[PDB]
Every structure is written in structure tokens, then in C-alpha cells.
Design an enzyme around this catalytic site. Sequence first.
Site, PDB file in Angstrom:
ATOM      1  N   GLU A  21       0.837  -1.205   0.000  1.00 49.60           N
ATOM      2  CA  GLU A  21       0.000   0.000   0.000  1.00 49.60           C
ATOM      3  C   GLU A  21       0.870   1.253   0.000  1.00 49.60           C
ATOM      4  O   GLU A  21       0.887   2.033   0.960  1.00 49.60           O
ATOM      5  CB  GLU A  21      -0.964   0.034   1.200  1.00 49.60           C
ATOM      6  CG  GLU A  21      -0.309  -0.175   2.578  1.00 49.60           C
ATOM      7  CD  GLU A  21      -1.322  -0.401   3.721  1.00 49.60           C
ATOM      8  OE1 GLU A  21      -2.508  -0.015   3.592  1.00 49.60           O
ATOM      9  OE2 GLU A  21      -0.921  -0.962   4.758  1.00 49.60           O
ATOM     10  N   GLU A  57       3.824   9.114  -3.205  1.00 49.05           N
ATOM     11  CA  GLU A  57       4.654   8.574  -2.141  1.00 49.05           C
ATOM     12  C   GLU A  57       5.792   7.744  -2.688  1.00 49.05           C
ATOM     13  O   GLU A  57       6.504   7.114  -1.907  1.00 49.05           O
ATOM     14  CB  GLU A  57       3.809   7.750  -1.150  1.00 49.05           C
ATOM     15  CG  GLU A  57       2.736   8.564  -0.531  1.00 49.05           C
ATOM     16  CD  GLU A  57       1.936   7.729   0.487  1.00 49.05           C
ATOM     17  OE1 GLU A  57       2.207   6.539   0.615  1.00 49.05           O
ATOM     18  OE2 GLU A  57       1.081   8.274   1.154  1.00 49.05           O
TER      19      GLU A  57
HETATM   20  C1  LIG Z   1       1.414   1.584   5.293  1.00 46.68           C
HETATM   21  S1  LIG Z   1       1.966   3.080   4.425  1.00 46.68           S
HETATM   22  C2  LIG Z   1       3.462   2.512   3.593  1.00 46.68           C
HETATM   23  C3  LIG Z   1       4.423   1.769   4.509  1.00 46.68           C
HETATM   24  O1  LIG Z   1       5.515   1.292   3.717  1.00 46.68           O
HETATM   25  C4  LIG Z   1       6.757   1.670   4.247  1.00 46.68           C
HETATM   26  N1  LIG Z   1       7.727   1.887   3.196  1.00 46.68           N
HETATM   27  C5  LIG Z   1       7.789   2.923   2.300  1.00 46.68           C
HETATM   28  N2  LIG Z   1       8.813   2.862   1.483  1.00 46.68           N
HETATM   29  C6  LIG Z   1       9.490   1.728   1.847  1.00 46.68           C
HETATM   30  C7  LIG Z   1      10.656   1.077   1.375  1.00 46.68           C
HETATM   31  N3  LIG Z   1      11.423   1.512   0.358  1.00 46.68           N
HETATM   32  N4  LIG Z   1      11.041  -0.040   1.996  1.00 46.68           N
HETATM   33  C8  LIG Z   1      10.306  -0.521   3.003  1.00 46.68           C
HETATM   34  N5  LIG Z   1       9.217   0.002   3.528  1.00 46.68           N
HETATM   35  C9  LIG Z   1       8.821   1.126   2.921  1.00 46.68           C
HETATM   36  C10 LIG Z   1       6.470   2.895   5.108  1.00 46.68           C
HETATM   37  O2  LIG Z   1       7.408   3.003   6.138  1.00 46.68           O
HETATM   38  C11 LIG Z   1       5.023   2.650   5.590  1.00 46.68           C
HETATM   39  O3  LIG Z   1       5.017   1.936   6.788  1.00 46.68           O
END
Ligand SMILES: CSC[C@H]1O[C@@H](n2cnc3c(N)ncnc32)[C@H](O)[C@@H]1O
Lengths: 310, 625
Positions: free
Chosen positions: B423, B432
Site C-alpha cells: 500500500e 509517495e
Molecule cells: C502503510 S503506508 C506505507 C508503509 O511502507 C513503508 N515503506 C515505504 N517505502 C518503503 C521502502 N522503500 N522499503 C520498506 N518500507 C517502505 C512505510 O514506512 C510505511 O510503513
Amino acid sequence: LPPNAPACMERQLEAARYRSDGALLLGASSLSGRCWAGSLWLFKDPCAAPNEGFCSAGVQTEAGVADLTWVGERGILVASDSGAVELWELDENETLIVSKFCKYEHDDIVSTVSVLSSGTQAVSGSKDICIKVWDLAQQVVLSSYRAHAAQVTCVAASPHKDSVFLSCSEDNRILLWDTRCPKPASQIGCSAPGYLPTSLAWHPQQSEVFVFGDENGTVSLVDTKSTSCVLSSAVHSQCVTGLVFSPHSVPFLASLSEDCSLAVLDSSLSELFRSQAHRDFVRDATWSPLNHSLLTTVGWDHQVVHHVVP
Amino acid sequence: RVSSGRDLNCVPEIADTLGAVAKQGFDFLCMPVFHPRFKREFIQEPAKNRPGPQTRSDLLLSGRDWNTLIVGKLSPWIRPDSKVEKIRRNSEAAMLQELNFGAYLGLPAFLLPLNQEDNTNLARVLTNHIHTGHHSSMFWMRVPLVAPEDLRDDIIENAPTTHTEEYSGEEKTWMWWHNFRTLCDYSKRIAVALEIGADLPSNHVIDRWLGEPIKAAILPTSIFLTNKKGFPVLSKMHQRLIFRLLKLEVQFIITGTNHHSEKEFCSYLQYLEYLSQNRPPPNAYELFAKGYEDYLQSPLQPLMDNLESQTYEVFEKDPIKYSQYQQAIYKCLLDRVPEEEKDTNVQVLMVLGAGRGPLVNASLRAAKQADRRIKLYAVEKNPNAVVTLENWQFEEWGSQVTVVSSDMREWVAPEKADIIVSELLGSFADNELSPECLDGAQHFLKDDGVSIPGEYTSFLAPISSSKLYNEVRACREKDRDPEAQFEMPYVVRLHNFHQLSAPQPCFTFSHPNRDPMIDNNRYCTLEFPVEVNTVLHGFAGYFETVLYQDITLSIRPETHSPGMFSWFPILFPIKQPITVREGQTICVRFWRCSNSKKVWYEWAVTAPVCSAIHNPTGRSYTIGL
Ligand SMILES: CSC[C@H]1O[C@@H](n2cnc3c(N)ncnc32)[C@H](O)[C@@H]1O
């Protein structure tokens, strides 16, 4: 001090009207201070006005009086700040003033009233832009007219025709009315806007000519049948709040103004008399029925002046 | 439930009047602070020296009553734009005098009319008052839906009312407001008090006021019809309008005298309470969004920032959203493991960006519902959330779920995945940086692996709203470029706005990305047909995503996922409102740009007029990689 008459009379005098017999009607409002209201007064002694203890009758209204007019000899028609047109009627003894009807038909200050020639009807103008035709017998509105686009400044009934009256407004229209026509109003006057019309006086002899003053101190003489503005004069330095024709067969025209002056004019609008007696706005004027060279004026300076006119 | 006030132009005693209108139900009173007919002179003697007092005393009410119960009104003889020089000057001194007495009294609002086209000197005196004292008073400009000249009875024989349609002429009073508020520099202290007449105009005239700061609607008694029993009521069309105004939480003002004499004055007020209590109740979305209407928030960056605990909490209280995720996983297992393999074949499934594990659970519920066997990796770089994960996997999930405390672009996976689930989507889908994250992760997806989500597309829609333009304008900050607030998106439950054209797809991304040259930069040109006169203040951003096949999520209004409140739309404002005429085309340009360190956007309008390129090089807004 007759009963029911207030001990004190509001500082701002709006209306001054002589009845057939020479008694003086006075309308006043309180335009400042704690309480904003008004009162109606009768002075069988015109030289004793404005003094409250030397009046023949008096009464208090709920709110201020913006315009006033006699309805015959015992009736008094009031334009109220409340939005009511009011009819007060004199005592049989003529020592009281008793409310006849108070009808709230306008949605803003009623600014002007005028009785129609029959004396059984009247037209009122208001800041709600509407103009209403009343049956004083029935105490109801016969017609309501939204012809103007801004507040109605003055409605003047025709001298001898129940059907005809003038109105003017801040929308710069002077409307000649005739309730006989299916479109009753008719826009007259010059095509150039000029300045806003503020006061109208029908001519007492030539029922087809009238005069109107504007917010720039100019008085104008107009024939409703021929061409456009034959005559006008710059009489005042401020708004022209009133125009009253004298009872004379060849009448004189009284001219009131916010420049705190009175002027008396002949048939060609030339200047005859001029009075600085007032220290505040000159609000009304009536000629005496008894002595035709006497001219009374009231103002917001609480003065009642009596002029002798050469 | 309805906040409402009484408009009077005659107050003989303030003490009684206030009690009478308090008694009738009203919350406040609009009245003159000087007497409406008391013309004052300031230049010419003798009238200049009129003995005082100039008006009634402030001792007549308490400061509490002045502050909360009294709306002032400008005297109707004050005409700053008169053709007469003397009247122009008297009215300037009078308007200042009256506005100062209003500020002297602490009034919460003061009414002023827009009743003609030229109010330039009116605006100037008001502007010159606003900049004298630095107060908090409001100014309600009284504007009619329909100018009185366009409303007069057709009773002047030699000056008839035109019976032709004049599309723009029928909007003229919006232009009165619009000039007046431009002149005054979009002061936040200047709102609209819209006056509603007996006959409403065409819808387009009423829709010119969408997005405007209407603080009050003025209802005259004139416009109330009478029902059989004799109460005052309103036409179906006026009722539609009242319903729209209620969604704007305006205060209603009742003006004029009682025209239903048999009944009292509660009846007008009661009708509004009737209409108010009798509207459709707020849905689950509109309950969640109460309090966030037109409230500007920064877009979350969950990559660059570690989200707080309560932020994941709001993510999780959206059950619709995880139902869809569960169903997308369910359908995907069945397609990948035939019934005759339901116990020999175990699918390796990776939640990428696991948070506190709502997807980890949705995957388990999906593999039970589908009766297939899965092996779960939970990847999460936010180490504070990994605390929650590792407590969940010790207490409950067991060795089925391997928590991985790593960035998915770094992680060397022990094996490949059948399914990656994530997500990572913002209100503008890719905002994002889910494209960049899933690209660094796809090397450990199997050559036939599925990604959920598989596709997402963003969307865009030009809007008008002077209420949000001003809010954005308010976001100036010391120590940064003084226009920088205009070059950077905002998450906001868009409310008082007008959408000018239908949304149109902007940027799309597909996962897995089977380009030999993966490039996530973008350039997109959109043309929006506009069929109204309006003013363009920015662009509304939405998005759609395909989780799997026909299972989708959307916040595009046309196809919004019912009941899901995880994403408000996003707002891309522009520096300088652009006028757009009926039939013209709004051309906008959107770029997705990137560094090795930053992603960002840049945008211009190029039709009907050009705007500056906004947020060039990420000077005002980046998303950290
Ligand atoms: C539930 S919202 C997205 C989630 O994914 C995580 N996330 C975003 N980008 C990455 C990444 N490159 N590697 C691991 N987790 C990520 C964020 O820390 C958040 O908890």
C-alpha cells in the site's frame, strides 16, 4: 401641556404643514441618543412652536417620522422608520391625536407619502424600492409597484387627478405614473443622467408641468408634453430636499436644502428671497393659508422660522 | 442547528429590540450603529458643527453583547462613489466614522452593500480602514443574486425589460463582488453576504458563487410563499438552494417585515429549522471528513519520514480498503495454485511496506478464505513499526511470517516472491514514490510473479475556489520564498469549490515494469473544456488503482470506492488566478521529475493564458527518495 403629549419634543424636525385654517402640523424624530422615535404635534398658535407646553395636541409614535402629510382636516398620514404607513386622526375636540391604522407593508424605512387628489387614497415610497397605492378608507394596499432599481426618494401625487403622480429614485429615474395605463409608469426627463433627482413639486396651476431638484443643488422646470428640460438654475450648494409652491395665483417656489438655506423663486427660477436662519438641515416648508406672504420652515436645528416674503 | 440573525433598519430602543429578537429565536441582530436617516456633514458650516451626541451610547449593552450579538450596518446614504464630489467626501468621512465606531464597539461583523457596478472608492476606504488597527472584525458585503435593475416589474411603458437571455449580463453582480475583492487584495476579512430574491436566476448564475466565501445568506420575507395552513414556506428551487447553503454552514439572515401577520416571526425561522433537520444525513465518508473541510494538510511522505503510531492507526480503521486487498489476494491464489495442488504448492508472498501488519493479516485471511498455503515476508523500513510487527509475529503469526526490518530497495531476499503486496499509494497515486520503491524490489519477484497493486493512474481536474486560493495564500512562512506555498500540493477535503471540467488521466504506472529502460519521469498535456465563466485557482488531483483484475480502489469522484475514506484529494494550486470564459479550453501541463535523491512535480497552465512553471527543479517541494 395637553394630555398624552410628550413633555419634550424630539430634536430633529422633519415636517411642517399648515392646515386649511392656519394650524401647524409638526413631525419630529429622534435621530440620535438612547431612543430613536418620533411624535406628531398640532399648533393652533403657529408662533408658539416649537414649545411643547403651548401646543393644542401631541402624541408619540413607535419610531421616527420620515415624511408627513395632512389627509383633509383631521387626518395625518405618516411614513415611519418601521416600514409602516400610519394614519392618525385628530380628536373631535381636537385635543388628542389617536392612531387609526398602522400597517407594516414596506420592508424598509418608508421615506415619502403623498395623498391623491380625491383625498381617499395615497401613494407611499420606501427604501425597499417599492411604491404602494393605499385605500385610506379600507386600510389596505391596492397596488404594489417595483418600477425603480434603488430606493424611492420622493412621490408627489397629482393635484387634480387620482390616477397621476410623480416618483423619483436613486436609480436616476423620474417616473410619471398613470394607473389607467396597463404599464402605469413612464420614464420622463432628460436622456443624459444628470444628477440624482431628490425632490418633486407639481405645479398648482398648469397640471402638465412640475419641478424637480437634484442632489447637486439644481432646480429644474419641466413640461411633461414638450421636448426636454426647458429651464433650470443652480440654487443650492448641496442636495435639494424640498420644493413647495406658494398659494398665490402666480405662485412662488420655495426651495430647501442641506446647505441649511431657504430660497424663494419666481416662475423663471430667479432668486427673490434667501434665508440663513437655520443652522442645520432645512427639512420642510409650508405657506400660511391666512397670510400668503408668510412662510414657515423647520429644520434639524429645532428652529421653527417664520419668513416674510417680498 | 441553524445559526440565524434578524436584519432591522429601525431600532427605537436597543434594549427592547434585542430582547424581542432574542425571544423570536434569533442568534444575533444586524442593526444601524448610527440612525439610518441621520445624514452628517463634515466640511461645510453650519451643519458641520451639529451638536452631539452623534449616536447612542456603548453603555447600553455589555461588551459581551456587542462582541457576539450585534452586526453593524453601513448607513444607506453613505455613497463613496457618488458622481457628486461633495457627496463623495462626506461619505468617506462617514464610512470611516462608522467603521471606527464598529471597531470601537468590538462588533464581530459589519455589513456593507454592493448595489452598483463601481465601488472603487468604497473598496479604497475599506482597504484604508483594514490597514488601520490590525483588528479581527469581519465585513459582510451585501450582494444580490440578481441586481434590482434586472428584477424590476415590467411596468415602464417606454423602458421595457429585455426578454432576451444575456448569459454574462445575468452574472453581473458576481463581477461586482469580484472586482471589489480584487481591489481589496483578497483580504480574509471580507466575505460575501449573498441576498436571495423572489425569483432565482439560471443555475449558472447561482454556480458563479461556488467557491466564494459566503458567510451569510439574506432571505427577505417577500420570497416566502404561503402553504394551505398559512405558514411561510419556500419553493422547491429555493429549498434546493438552502440545502446547498447549509452544506456551507452559512448564517441565515431574515430581513423585511412580517408578511404572515396571522402567524408570528418564529415561523420564518422555524421553516429553516424544518429544512435543516430534514436533509439527507451524512454518510460514513462525510462523518469522517467533518472538521477537515477545505483544511490544508501536507502530503505524507512515508518513505522519507517514519510515520507515527496514530498515523498507522488511521490507515487501519478503513475496513473497505483491506477487504479489497484480501479479495485481490484471494482471487490471485486461486489463479496460481490449482485445486489439485492446494497442499503441495506453497506461495511465497511479500508485503512490501508492511507498517503494523494490516496487509499481513489480510493476506492470511485471504489464504484461509481461498484454502491455499502461503509463506509471508513482512518488509518494513520504519523500525518503530517493526516493533509492532515483531510483537505480533511472536504473539500470534508465528514462523509463518518473517518480519524483515529493511528498505525493499536494499533487502537481499533469500528467495523470490510469487506475490508482492504493497500500500505505497498517495492521493496522487505515485506521490509517495511507490514507482521507485517497487522497481528496486522487482528483482526478487519471480519471472511470473504478480504485484498487488498492478496498476495505478492519477487524475486531474481544474477547479475554482477563491476560498482555497486565500488559504493557500495564508501559508507564507519566514525564511523561505514568499510564494513557495503556491508551488506545492496539499491534501485537503475539498469542499467550497467548483470543479470546472471532468477529471482526466494524468500519469499511469504498471508493476512489474517490463521496460528494458525503466524511466519514471513523465510529461503530460491535458485540455479541459470549460463551459462556464469562472476563475481557475488550481487543480484537484485524484487516482485509481487496479489491485488485481477487476478489484479496484478509486478516489476519482465518478468511480469513488464507496465508504473508503483513506484518501482525501490533493490540491495543486497556481500563483495567479486565471480568468476563464465560457467555451474556452484550460490547457495544463504536468511533469514528474526526479534526481537520485528527490522526486517532484512541476506544472503550468498554457491556455487560455500562460502561468509560470511552478515548483521548478523542486525549489519549493520535493518528495525524498
Ligand atoms: C502503510 S503506508 C506505507 C508503509 O511502507 C513503508 N515503506 C515505504 N517505502 C518503503 C521502502 N522503500 N522499503 C520498506 N518500507 C517502505 C512505510 O514506512 C510505511 O510503513
